[PDB]
Design an enzyme around this catalytic site. Structure first.
Site, PDB file in Angstrom:
ATOM      1  N   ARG A  50     -22.136  29.823  13.926  1.00 22.96           N
ATOM      2  CA  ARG A  50     -22.626  29.736  12.554  1.00 22.96           C
ATOM      3  C   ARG A  50     -23.106  28.302  12.293  1.00 22.96           C
ATOM      4  NH1 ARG A  50     -17.948  29.326   8.751  1.00 22.96           N
ATOM      5  NH2 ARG A  50     -18.729  27.173   8.724  1.00 22.96           N
ATOM      6  N   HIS A 104     -20.073  28.322   5.772  1.00 20.48           N
ATOM      7  CA  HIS A 104     -19.715  29.724   5.616  1.00 20.48           C
ATOM      8  C   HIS A 104     -20.639  30.395   4.599  1.00 20.48           C
ATOM      9  CE1 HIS A 104     -17.567  33.421   4.891  1.00 20.48           C
ATOM     10  NE2 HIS A 104     -17.534  33.120   3.605  1.00 20.48           N
ATOM     11  N   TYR A 137     -14.482  20.711   7.982  1.00 18.57           N
ATOM     12  CA  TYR A 137     -13.412  21.250   8.818  1.00 18.57           C
ATOM     13  C   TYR A 137     -13.860  21.553  10.248  1.00 18.57           C
ATOM     14  CZ  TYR A 137     -15.718  25.540   7.140  1.00 18.57           C
ATOM     15  OH  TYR A 137     -16.653  26.497   6.812  1.00 18.57           O
TER      16      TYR A 137
END
Ligand SMILES: Cc1ncc(C[n+]2csc(CCOP(=O)(O)OP(=O)(O)O)c2C)c(N)n1
Ligand SMILES: Cc1ncc(C[n+]2csc(CCOP(=O)(O)OP(=O)(O)O)c2C)c(N)n1
Ligand SMILES: CC(C)CCC(=O)O
Ligand SMILES: [Mg+2]
Ligand SMILES: [Mg+2]
Lengths: 361, 323, 362, 323
Positions: free
Chosen positions: A264, A268, A277
Site C-alpha cells: 500500500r 490507509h 508508523y
C-alpha cells in the site's frame, strides 16, 4: 499447466529485467499484454485523481489503492465480467475500473450524486453494480465473505457455470466470518475463489501482529483447499494463478485461497497518517517494486512498449477521467426523499409517516 | 385437517418447495434428522441434498450464505437452531442482510427467510431461548414475524417465503405441539403486517404475540368470569406492526396491557407502549402497562416465574382497570 | 522429547496387547497409572448414573460422555488442578469429575439445587467452579474459546506460570469465534492449549459435512502453531501429547491445537436419537475401541491390575456417587429470589422493583 | 485545565493505568498509532506493549479476550474502533460478557470496559455513524454509558474502570473535539447511573444524551429567547438510568420531549418514554414526544437530514407546549 501450492517463495513470472520465467510458454497475445498495462495505468491514474477529489473537497474519503494495480487488474481479467460475480471491499476501485464499471458510476458514488446506482446511500469507496455482478461494498471487514460463499453455492445448485471471486485485505483474514464463510464454501465444493490482497498492514497493525501463520496461503490448510503464494506486484503471475483457481472452481473442483502479496503506497485512507508508523526503508524498498514500471520493462523488452505510446495512453485516460467526472457531477445531488426508499421493496407505514414529518420541515 | 404448529410449518415448507425449485432449506441438523423439532422432517428425503442441506456449525455462515444465495438466485429458508444462537452471525444479519437493498440502491435484494425456535415455558429437555426480536425490530430492513397458532404458522411462513424482503420468523417452541387446530391443506397465505383479533372485548385491550399467548388467553377468560371483557390482539408481525389494529382497539377500550416474555428494557412492547402514549394520550383512561420478561438472563430453575404468569397478567389488568 | 505434528496416523502409545509404543520411556509411576484407570471408570460410571437420573426424571437433560473418558481424564491429569484454568463445554463432566470437582456440585448443577455453586441458573451439563478454575460452561458453541485466549494472555502478562486448556467438539471448530480466538492467542504466544474432542458428529451433522480439512489438527496451520492428531481412545497418548503442549505453553512457547479422536457411544443428548442417522455398524465398530478395556489390558500386562482391585474400586465409586447424589438432593430447591441475584454486583433500581413485583405473586 | 473530550479520555486512561498495573488497553490500532482518534496516544510509549496492545482485526477476539482477562485478573479497557463494528463480536458481548456473573452464580466476574466511538453527524454512512446503545441496554448484565462533555468523559471512564460490572462506554465522535471545557487534573470520578442537569426549567423537559446534546442545548437556548423555560437533562448513563431525575423533572414540567440519533423502533428513548407513560400518566399535560433517528440505515447523502436538527426539536417542543 498447474502452479505449485504453498510455495516457499512467492510465485513470479516476470524477471527482474523483463524476462519470462514461466515453465509453460507465454500464451497471451501482444494486444492483451498491452491491455493489462493500460488497465494498471488507468487504475493508478484513477487513484491519483481520487487524491485530487479529496484536495478539492469533491469527495470526503478515499482508500489509496496505489500498489494494488497488478493484483486488481489481474483479477478483473481472470474472470468473465458480467457473467462471474465479484465480492470486493473498499480498496478495489482499480478492480472495479478494469472490470468495466463506468467511471460515471464510480465517481458518482464517490461524490454521492444521482450518477451513483447505489443512490449515494453510503460513504465513498462503496461502489456496486448489478449489471456487472459487483456486489455492493459493505463496511464491516470480511462481512462479504459468507455472502460470496452463498452466491457460489447458488451457482453450483443452479449449475450456472459461473464463478464467484472474493477479494479482501490481510487484516480481514483475522475475522471469524472470514473463516466461517470459506469453511462452508469449501465443504460444499462451491465455485468460489478467495483472494487476499496482502499489503502487510491493516491500517497501522502490521502482519506480525495480525496473525502468527507465516503466510495467508497457509490458512488454506484449515479448509482442505489449495493455497497459493503469489507476487502481487507481478501482473502475469497474479493473472495466471487466479485464472487457474477460477478454472478449477468453474469445473466443479471447489474453492482456492490465493494470496497476492502487494504494498500500500498511500496511507490507509485520507483519514490517516502512513508516514507515522512505517519505516522509510520499507516504503522505499517496496516503491522500487512498483508493478507498473515492472510490467513496462517486460513489454519494452518485447517491442510492446515505447515512450510515445505511454503518452497517448496517459492522455486518453486523463480525458476519460474528465468526461466521467463531468457526467457524475452533472447528474445532480440525490433527492432528500431517497433517504426513505429501498429500506424494503415498499415503504411501510412508519417510514411514510417519518418521511411526511420530515417533509413538513 | 387438524394439526400442530410443527405439522403446519412442515406443510408450508413442503408446499412452497413443491411450487418453486428455488426454495431451499439450510441449517444445522435440518436434513437427515429432519430438525431438532422435526419441522423439516421428510423434506430431504423428498427434495434431495441440493434442496435441503445440513450446514457446518456456524450461524454466520448460515445467515451469510443464505444472503448470498438470495442475492444470486435461490429462495433460502435458513434455520437458526435457537433464537439465542443468532448472535454468532449477528453481523451478517444486520450489516449484510438488513442493509443490502438500501446500500445497493435497490440493485441487490435479499429474498430470504430465517426461522428459529424461541422462548422457554416448557421443559422438554431443550434449551430455553430468550426472545431477541427487539434486536431485529431495532434493525431497519428486517421484517419480523412471531406466530402462535398452527393456522398462522402455515399462512405466514408461506407469506414470508413469497415476500422479497428479508423475514426473521420466530417460532415459540412451547407452541410447537401445544395444541392442534384446523389447518386447510389448500394453498393459502396470511398477510404480513396484520394483527389477528383473538377475542373481542370493550373494557381492556391485551396486546400480545407469540410465546405468552396461552397465559394471555386464559387471563382474558378469568377476566370474563369477573364481568370484564378483554380484547386479545395477537400482533403476529412485529415489523411492520399493525398500527391501525392497535390504535383502534386502545381507542375503544381506553386501557391496555402489553405482554411478552422478552426482556423489558428497550423491548418491542416498549416501542408499542411508547407509541400509544405519543399518539393516543387523549384516549387513555389508564397508563399503558407492560408485563414482560425480567431484565435478567433467562433463568432455568425459575422458568415458571420468568415467563409471565396468568396471575402476573391479571395483576396488571386489575391495576389498569382500577385506575 | 517432542511428538510429531500433523501426523497422518493418529499418535498412539498403547499397543493392542498392552505394549508400550513410545519413543521415550514410560515415566508414570504405578500409582499414577492406576489413578488414570480409576478416573476413567468413575467418569464412565457417572455417565451411566446420568442415564438413570433422566429415566427417573431427576434431571431434564444429559449429554452422554461415554467414549470420551480417555481424552477427558487425560486432560484433567495433564494440568495442575486448582492452579491451571479449564474452559470446558457441556460434555466434559468426566473431565470435571477427574479434575476434582465435588460430585455434590456437579449433581447439584444437574438437579438445580442449592448445592450448585452456579445457583441453578442454567440447564443441566453446565457445571462451573471458581475453586478449580473451571470456567462455567456457556450454551453458545465455541463462545468460550476467545475468553480462554484472554485468560491465557492474562496469565502471561501477570507471570503466574499458569496455562489455560480449552476443550470443544468437532462442530465447534466451524464457528468464527473459534478461529478468531485461537488466532489472537497464537499471535500473542499466550499459554493456551486448544483441545478438540473429535467424535465425528455435531449432533447429527457428520465430520464430512462439518469441514473440508481432512483433520482438525490441520487447522493449526492457519495460526502457525503446532497441530497434533492423537488417538483419543488411548489415555496415555492423550495424556502425554496434551502434557507436552501444556509444558510448551507453560514455558512461553505459545499455544497448540490437539485433536483427540474419540467416539460418542450414546446419542448427542437425552433429547436426541442416535439411531436415526448412524449405522449400527459404525457404532459397534468403535465399541471395540472402548478406552477403558484397552488401558485395562495395558495395566494387566504389567501386573498393575486384577479383578479384585477393579471390584474394590467400582464399589468405592458407586458409594461415592450415591453419597454425592444424596447431598445434592438434600440441598433443597434454589430460592425464587435468586432469580435477580448476580445480574450485577448489586441489584439496581429496576431489578429491585421487578423482584418486588414478583413477590406480589409468590 | 481546558481540554477536548479526547484529551480528557486519554487523561483518564493514563491516570487509571498509573494507579493500577492491571489496567490494560487492547484493540485495533491503539498502540503505536495512538488510536484512530488519538484517545490512546502516548500510552504505549509510557506503559509498554504489554499494557497497550494492538490486536488482530477481530471484534470477537477483542471482546472475548477482554472477558477472559477480566475474569482472570486484569482490568481491560477494550476498544471497538467504531460502534458499528461491535456486531462481529456481539455474541461475545451478550453471551459471555453480560451473563458471566449470572450464569456462574457469582463465581466469575467481568471487570471490563468496552469503549467505542459512536453517533452520526460525521458523514460516516452506514458503519461510521451508528448509535447501537439499544442493543446493549436490552442485554441484561451490561452497564451502558454515553458521555457528551470532556468533564464527564474523564469522570465516568475512570468510574467505569473501577466498576466491577461490565461497562459499554460510548463516545460520540462528533464531540471528540467539539469544545475545550474545564477538566480537573486531580483525580475524581463521577457516579454511573446519575443524570446531569444542564438547564433548570419548568415549562418543558428535554431528555437526551450523547450525540444530540449540541442541538438540544441550542434548542433550549432558542426556547428561552421565546419565553419558554425548558429543563435540559443529560442522562449520561443509559443503564441503569436515573429514574428519579427523569420522573422528578417530568413531574414538575408536565411535558417532555426525548431526543436521540438512534433509530426509533425499540430504541432507548422509547424505553424511557414508555416508562414515563406507565408511571406518570397523571402528571402528563402532553404526550411524551420522541425526536429520534429514522428507522433506516444511516444515510450518507442525507446525513444532515437524518441527525436531529434544532428545528426538528423545536417543532416537537411546540407540539408538547401547544397540547
Ligand atoms: C468489523 C470491522 N472492524 C473495524 C473496521 C475498521 N477498519 C476499516 S479498514 C481496516 C483495515 C483493514 O485492513 P486489510 O483487511 O488489511 O485491508 P487494507 O485496508 O490493508 O487493504 C479496519 C480495521 C471495520 N471496517 N470493520
Ligand atoms: C451457537 C450455537 N449454535 C447451535 C447450538 C446447538 N448445539 C448444541 S450442541 C451442538 C453440537 C456441537 O457439537 P460438537 O462441537 O462436535 O460437540 P459434541 O456434542 O459432538 O461433543 C449444537 C449444534 C449451540 N449451542 N450454539
Ligand atoms: C445444553 C447446550 C449446551 C446444548 C443444547 C442446546 O444448545 O440447546
Ligand atoms: Mg492490509
Ligand atoms: Mg462432535
Amino acid at each position: 499447466h498447474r502452479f505449485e501450492t504453498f510455495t516457499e517463495e512467492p510465485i513470479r513470472l516476470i524477471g527482474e529485467e523483463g524476462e519470462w520465467l514461466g515453465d509453460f510458454p507465454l500464451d497471451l497475445e501482444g494486444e492483451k499484454l498491452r491491455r493489462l498495462y493500460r488497465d494498471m495505468l488507468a487504475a493508478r491514474m484513477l487513484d491519483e485523481r481520487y487524491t485530487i477529489l479529496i484536495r478539492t473537497g469533491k469527495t470526503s474519503f478515499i482508500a489509496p489503492a496505489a500498489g494494488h494495480e497488478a493484483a486488481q487488474v489481474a483479477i478483473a481479467h481472470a474472470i468473465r465480467p458480467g457473467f462471474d460475480w465479484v465480492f470486493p471491499y473498499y480498496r478495489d476501485h482499480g478492480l472495479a475500473l478494469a472490470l468495466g464499471i463506468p467511471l460515471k458510476e464510480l465517481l458518482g458514488q464517490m461524490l454521492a450524486t444521482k450518477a451513483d446506482p447505489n443512490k449515494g446511500r453510503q460513504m465513498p469507496e462503496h461502489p456496486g453494480s448489478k449489471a456487472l455482478n459487483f456486489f455492493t461494498v459493505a463496511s464491516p471487514i470480511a462481512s462479504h465473505v459468507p455472502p460470496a460463499a452463498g452466491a457460489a453455492i447458488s451457482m453450483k445448485l443452479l449449475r450456472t457455470g459461473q464463478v464467484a471471486v472474493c477479494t479482501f485485505g490481510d487484516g480481514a483474514t483475522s475475522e471469524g466470518d472470514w473463516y466461517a464463510g470459506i469453511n462452508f464454501a469449501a465443504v460444499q465444493g462451491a465455485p468460489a475463489v478467495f483472494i487476499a490482497e496482502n499489503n502487510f498492514y491493516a491500517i497501522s497493525v502490521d502482519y506480525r501482529h495480525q496473525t502468527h501463520s507465516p503466510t495467508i496461503a497457509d490458512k488454506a490448510h484449515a479448509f482442505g483447499i489449495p493455497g497459493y503464494l503469489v507476487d502481487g506486484m507481478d501482473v502475469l503471475a497474479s493473472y495466471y494463478v487466479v485464472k487457474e483457481a477460477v478454472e478449477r472452481a468453474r469445473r466443479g473442483e471447489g474453492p482456492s485461497l490465493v494470496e497476492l502479496r502487494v504494498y500500500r503506497y498511500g496511507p490507509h485512507s485520507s483519514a490517516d497518517d502512513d508516514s507515522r508508523y512505517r519505516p522509510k526503508e520499507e516504503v522505499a524498498f517496496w516503491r522500487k517494486k512498483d508493478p507498473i514500471p515492472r510490467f513496462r520493462r517486460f513489454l519494452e523488452a518485447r517491442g510492446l512498449w515505447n515512450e510515445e505510446w505511454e503518452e497517448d495512453v496517459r492522455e486518453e485516460i486523463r480525458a476519460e477521467l474528465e468526461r466521467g467526472l463531468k457526467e457524475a457531477e452533472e447528474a445532480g445531488p440525490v433527492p432528500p426523499e431517497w433517504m426513505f426508499e429501498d429500506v424494503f421493496a415498499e415503504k411501510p407505514w412508519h417510514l411514510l409517516r417519518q418521511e411526511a414529518l420530515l417533509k413538513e420541515e | 385437517a387438524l394439526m400442530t404448529m410443527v405439522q403446519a410449518l412442515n406443510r408450508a415448507l413442503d408446499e412452497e418447495m413443491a411450487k418453486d425449485p428455488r426454495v431451499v432449506v439450510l441449517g444445522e441438523d435440518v436434513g437427515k434428522r429432519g430438525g431438532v423439532f422435526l419441522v423439516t422432517e421428510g423434506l430431504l428425503q423428498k427434495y434431495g441434498p441440493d434442496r435441503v442441506m445440513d450446514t457446518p456449525l456456524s450461524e454466520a455462515a448460515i445467515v451469510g450464505a443464505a444472503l448470498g444465495m438470495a442475492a444470486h438466485g435461490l429462495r433460502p429458508v435458513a434455520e437458526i437452531q435457537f433464537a439465542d444462537y443468532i448472535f454468532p452471525g449477528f453481523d451478517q444479519l444486520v450489516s449484510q442482510v438488513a442493509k443490502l437493498r438500501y446500500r445497493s440502491g435497490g440493485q441487490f435484494t435479499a429474498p430470504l427467510v430465517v426461522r428459529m425456535p424461541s422462548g422457554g415455558g416448557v421443559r422438554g429437555g431443550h434449551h430455553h431461548s430468550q426472545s431477541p426480536e427487539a434486536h431485529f425490530v431495532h434493525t431497519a430492513g428486517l421484517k419480523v414475524v412471531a406466530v402462535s397458532t398452527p393456522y398462522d404458522a402455515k399462512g405466514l411462513l408461506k407469506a414470508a417465503i413469497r415476500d422479497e424482503d428479508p423475514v426473521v420468523f420466530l417460532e415459540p417452541k412451547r407452541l410447537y405441539r401445544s395444541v392442534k387446530e384446523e389447518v386447510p391443506e389448500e394453498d393459502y397465505t396470511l398477510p404480513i403486517g396484520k394483527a389477528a383479533l383473538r377475542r373481542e372485548g370493550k373494557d381492556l385491550t391485551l396486546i400480545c404475540y407469540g410465546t405468552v399467548m396461552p397465559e394471555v388467553l386464559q387471563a382474558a377468560a378469568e377476566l370474563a368470569k369477573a364481568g370484564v371483557s378483554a380484547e386479545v390482539l395477537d400482533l403476529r408481525t412485529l415489523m411492520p406492526w399493525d398500527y391501525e389494529a392497535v390504535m383502534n382497539s386502545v381507542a375503544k377500550t381506553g386501557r391496555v396491557v402489553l405482554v411478552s416474555d422478552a426482556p423489558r428494557h428497550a423491548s418491542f412492547v416498549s416501542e408499542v407502549a411508547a407509541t400509544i402514549a405519543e399518539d393516543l394520550l387523549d384516549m387513555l383512561l389508564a397508563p399503558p402497562i407492560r408485563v414482560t420478561g425480567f431484565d435478567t438472563p433467562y433463568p432455568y430453575a425459575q422458568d415458571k416465574l420468568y415467563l409471565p404468569t396468568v396471575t402476573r397478567i391479571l395483576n396488571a389488568a386489575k391495576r389498569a382497570l382500577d385506575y
